[PDB]
Design a protein around this ligand. Structure first.
Ligand SMILES: [Mn+2]
Ligand SMILES: [Mn+2]
Ligand SMILES: [Mn+2]
Ligand SMILES: [Mn+2]
Ligand SMILES: [Mn+2]
Ligand SMILES: [Mn+2]
Ligand SMILES: [Mn+2]
Ligand SMILES: [Mn+2]
Lengths: 226, 223, 226, 223
């Protein structure tokens, strides 16, 4: 299977409450935190990591609201391949709901032992268009809808994904400090008062694709909840 | 053929080394005298913005001269909406190298609405053996000293960034890009025929047949 | 007097219409363009310059609207001192109105002839606070009001200014390419249908202060319309 | 006294050269063994973010070792809201230099609302004679090779950035900073007593009386 490191936001029953979690190759989060999923409101996720601290951290917030944060000491050099692809995933249950990404930005940096040796990548979407050639859209994912990214069909069990086209060089054996930082504003709107949903920022192998039966709780990242 | 907009640095015998702006033709739309310094590391600065509709480049060497060349052009009319950026190089009958020590790019689409910036930005300061985010064409290679060797070390090589770039948009108030790269042309011969170039092309541009020498690996014919 | 290079947006009668203009040491713009001042709506100004082109350019736009642009070939090396301070200015006439700056960002870069020799400065305000120590507030200018910058009193003839604390190194004799880029979102709200107002992004000597009698058409930048 | 948070690199005889994190005291809260390489250019990387509340530094030399030292600390409780950042240095009885070749900083305040980022970012790659955006204290100077000479070329010098920095805010979901600088300590003596440090202090911090030698120009007494 694919190598997945993710930061999911799910409201599925399958802890008995909405949470934010850090998944290292398994849907069974290595660490979680209570999340107050606010239907209709726009939320913001901040994911960060640096090779010095070897600590992955995320923070989800809503305006005038709470903020769920979850960290996990992990050396991605041991988990992920050298070259990866980053993305966003989403899955819907039996509920009518949307997983709209309003914005998305990423920054990766490899700093070598030598002088002025920085290597970086940085994309920043604040408006998706109909023909977004720099995004690999998988599943029921689409663009252009209000200049937004619709991960799940805009709905009865839907799984969508959107990874950036260019492969990302997460780590290097010669780097003194490698680090990344992602951010995205979402909006989960559902008519139902308590929908089962799930978004996630994931890092995977350059050729990761939706596993068969990765629906619902599997977030489109895992083929089974092993 | 492919749609090419380039900023070349050639020493192929106007009757002298120059820096030029090519719009779909190897016959530069505008040039400037360039003092090609063999062995020394040079720096190219290419810039453009939709407001000014003026493409400009500046090549310099440390403690040296600086050739600059600008050209009023609306790339919205020349280039497709989605492109791929890159570096090209070709050698003549001479023993020489076209080593890219560094390369960075920045593209920005600013919409009419509030806080609506879209951007892309890569920065190579050290190329590795397996550079998956670069499409290497021709005799181009990586890892050699953590550098990019465009030509074989009559050679022709290319290196384009993997992700397609969104140069323009009909809804943007201001689109702009900025590239920079440090080169080093070393040749045993005192007066070699060489040529590097920063080019913007269609996402699927490939080395045209017979685009050797003066054609810079960008054009199939000068006519 | 002070050395002023500015990009003003005025609706004063004193051409016979609202315009956007480039001022080089004189209130009498060196170049202007028709501006459709939209009362109540938030506008965005984009000012840019680079030593290669020696061309100053500005672009003002409103959402779903028009866009006034004005350029002017000028070598700031000959006009401005090496070290300057950047800022925003505003003045009100006999009208009740506001000059609210919602955001402001600047980027200055000095690139030398040598390798990897970039020098830069970059600030970005998206929310002003009550105690904004990194801003020199002159005139009736204030902060904190909604986390915004109120240039003119929030009004019967008011002149305010706000310059960044750190001096900016615009040019250098040893640089191959110097360049700057500023952006700011404004909002001019007036009860009157046709108010006389004026905002401006200005570059001046590190110790520039509101000239005596620089009210109204003088934009708080010039002591007299010479 | 002033409020000082610093990341020092001293060779003043623990009984060996080290890299340390000082929170209001010269007696480091955490240290690590540092192989001070005389003559060679080193690079310090200091980072911090409000989520992790962990200050970390990493010092390296080309083709060399790398000393790293981290310390869990909430700067919201230590530092004032508005500060000034800088570099400090002190020499012992030895003939030596404390040359800063480059220096860059980035501070970011991200609010709970949408697209609410506030940032500051300076980047010196070449200091000039009249560097108006730097507050030079002590024997500190600029222009020498387009470099920053902290100590006299028992010296003590400092260089803080002019604009006050807004480290934290009560309304921010995530605040963070990142500094980097390349130094070069050259000494004729094989084992000199020296010390550089990146420090964060109150906007009006000045060299304390008798903050020489081991005190790094930051503290008036070690007690
Ligand atoms: Mn879960
Ligand atoms: Mn590892
Ligand atoms: Mn030519
Ligand atoms: Mn056009
Ligand atoms: Mn006017
Ligand atoms: Mn000049
Ligand atoms: Mn110590
Ligand atoms: Mn605190």
């Amino acid at each position: 299977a694919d190598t997945i490191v993710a930061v999911e936001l799910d409201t599925y029953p399958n802890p008995s409450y909405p949470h934010i979690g850090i998944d290292i190759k398994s849907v069974r989060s290595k660490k979680t935190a209570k999340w107050n999923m606010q239907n209709g409101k726009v939320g913001t996720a901040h994911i960060i990591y640096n090779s010095v601290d070897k600590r992955l951290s995320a923070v989800v917030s809503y305006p005038n609201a709470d903020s769920a944060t979850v960290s996990y000491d992990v050396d991605l050099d041991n988990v992920l391949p050298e070259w990866v692809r980053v993305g966003l995933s989403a899955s819907t249950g039996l509920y009518k709901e949307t997983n709209t990404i309003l914005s998305w930005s990423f920054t990766s940096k490899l700093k070598s032992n030598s002088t002025h040796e920085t290597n970086a990548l940085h994309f920043m979407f604040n408006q998706f268009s109909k023909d977004q050639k720099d995004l690999i859209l998988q599943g029921d994912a689409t663009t252009g809808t209000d200049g937004n990214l619709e991960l799940t069909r805009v709905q009865g069990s839907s799984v969508g994904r959107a990874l950036f086209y260019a492969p990302v060089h997460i780590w290097e054996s010669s780097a003194v400090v490698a680090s990344f930082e992602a951010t995205f504003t979402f909006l989960i709107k559902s008519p139902d008062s308590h929908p089962a949903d799930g978004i996630a920022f994931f890092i995977s192998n350059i050729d990761s694709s939706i596993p068969s039966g990765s629906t619902g709780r599997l977030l489109g990242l895992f083929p089974d909840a092993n």
